[PDB]
Amino acid sequence: MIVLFVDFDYFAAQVEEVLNPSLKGKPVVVCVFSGRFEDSGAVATANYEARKFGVKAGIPIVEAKKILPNAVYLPMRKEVYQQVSSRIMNLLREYSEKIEIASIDEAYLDISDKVRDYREAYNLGLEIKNKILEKEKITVTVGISKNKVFAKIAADMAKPNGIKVIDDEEVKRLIRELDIADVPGIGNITAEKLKKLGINKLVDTLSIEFDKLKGMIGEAKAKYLISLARDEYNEPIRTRVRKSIGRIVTMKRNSRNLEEIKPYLFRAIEESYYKLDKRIPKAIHVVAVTEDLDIVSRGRTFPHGISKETAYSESVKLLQKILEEDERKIRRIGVRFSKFI
DNA sequence: GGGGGAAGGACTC
DNA sequence: ATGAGTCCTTCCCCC
Ligand SMILES: [Ca+2]
Ligand SMILES: [Ca+2]
């Protein structure tokens, strides 16, 4: 198989640059302001100018300003980035019918029936980077290899404004040499579990007893990693259909008082129904983030679609249950809708 | 034994 | 110490 992965460069920040070019060359930081206090919230994405100094997605906004007090700080404009992303995704469809939109700035293309080798594959990547640059003035990084996983790794290695092929021989190299923490789907919690087994490379998963591996990291992740180490990983490029839509908002102050929470919960439903646009959910889940950043949820499935008014009443009931069955204060509250008709 | 739903968990970006 | 969404695991009802 030949997979060509497109990863939009520091997307939200770069979009802000396209709309206001004077930002070029400067450290740009797109943030989500939580509104609890002055500058509360976190960084959603920074351009490379900002990243060079350790201003990155995830850190508090306050911290970022300590490091870069004179950087441009901008609020998330999600809807804008989405409209821009949609137009780019529409460009990529010109190069394959087999295309998987993984997120707002990631797309996988099965180009097996378009190019005969990696030479032709790498050229088509150039053609794609150019096209996106011509039409939208956005840079992207293209990663190419025999499966989705290594294509992503190609792009991890080449970003930003890059392009890389990981040919058959280098896959073998990487199975032996690549730090297993850098495998897509291996986070700190799992990396830690693995290192605690001597496993630092994909190849190591082939010499450990399977039950030992499964026993610690679960059956799926084990099968996953072994298949990669065997050079047998296969997952076809599939059109993804969204499976849920939801909104979760930060409360101005923590609480377990139902009337205090209701208004935030209700705003989350309003926004969610806006987002659903024509899709009718059969399942609603209420999601709370506790004071200690734990996540608790209660949901219910219906043998029919959920109307906004049913969402409103059921959500209160589900929030109650959360309050009855857990004593902590809530920091964040929201809703998630799924099981579309 | 395992299918399917609910809730918690990890990870992605 | 934000926000959105996906897949997996555990535990339990049930066949
Ligand atoms: Ca990106
Ligand atoms: Ca990792």
Cα A4 → chain centroid: 18
**A106 labelled catalytic:** yes
Name the fold adopted by A2-10+78-166.
Answer: Alpha-Beta Plaits (3.30.70)
Q: Which of A245, A265, A272 is nearest to A322 (CA)?
A: A265
3-class secondary-structure state, position A30: strand
3-class secondary-structure state, position A6: strand
CA of A137 to C1' of C9 (A): 43
| Cα–Cα distance, A202 to A232 (Å, whole number) | 12
**Alpha-carbon separation of residue A111 from A6, A81, A199, A236, A282 (angstroms):** 12, 26, 33, 12, 36
Fold matches, A11-77 and A167-233: no
Q: Which nucleotides of B are covered by protein (CB under 7 A)?
A: 5-13
Positive or negative, the CA dihedral A301, A304, A305, A311 is negative
Phi, psi (rounded to 5 degrees) for A27? -70, 115
Cα A162 → chain centroid: 20
Is there a cis peptide before residue A160, judged by omega within 30 degrees of 0?
A: yes
> How far does the centroid of ligand 1 lie from the alpha carbon of residue A15, in Å?
12
CA of A32 to C1' of C3 (A): 8
Strand C at less than 7 A from CB of A62: yes
Q: Known binder of ligand: residue A105?
A: yes
Do A283 and A337 touch, CB atoms closer than 8 A? Answer: yes
CATH number of A244-336, picked from 3.10.20.520, 2.60.40.1930, 2.40.110.10, 3.30.1490.100:
3.30.1490.100
Q: Which residue is nearest to the C1' sugar atom of B13, using CA?
A: A103
CA of A220 to C1' of B11 (A): 14
Q: Which of A310, A256, A259, A260 is nearest to A288 (CA)?
A: A256
Structure tokens at A172: 């073998």
Q: Known binder of ligand: residue A117?
A: no
| Cα–Cα distance, A282 to A314 (Å, whole number) | 12
3-class secondary-structure state, position A339: strand
Cα A51 → chain centroid: 18
Phi, psi (rounded to 5 degrees) for A148? -60, -40
Phi, psi (rounded to 5 degrees) for A157? -80, -25
Q: What is the resolution of this structure in A?
A: 2.4
Structure tokens at A229: 């180490």
Do A99 and A239 touch, CB atoms closer than 8 A? Answer: yes
Radius of gyration (C-alpha) of chain A in whole angstroms: 22
- Tokens 């770069």 correspond to A14
Do A165 and A122 touch, CB atoms closer than 8 A? Answer: yes
- DSSP H or E segment with residue A338: strand A330-340
The domains of chain A are located at 2-10+78-166, 11-77, 167-233, 244-336
> How far does the centroid of ligand 1 lie from the alpha carbon of residue A53, in Å?
18
The CATH number of domain A11-77 is 3.40.1170.60 = yes
| Cα–Cα distance, A54 to A60 (Å, whole number) | 12
DSSP string, A75-110: E--HHHHHHHHHHHHHHHTTT-S-EEEEETTEEEEE
DSSP string, A259-326: HHHHHHHHHHHHHHHHHHTT--EEEEEEEEEETTS-EEEEEEE-SS---HHHHHHHHHHHHHHHHHT-
Selected catalytic residue, list A49, A106, A136, A314? A106
Chain A residues 240-279, Cβ below 7 A from strand C: 240, 242-250, 271, 275
Looking only at the bridges linking them, the beta strands covering A140-145 and A106-110 are unpaired
Strand C at less than 7 A from CB of A34: yes
Q: Which CATH architecture is the domain A167-233 placed in? A: Orthogonal Bundle (1.10)
- Please tell me the number of the ligand nearest to residue A15's CA: 1
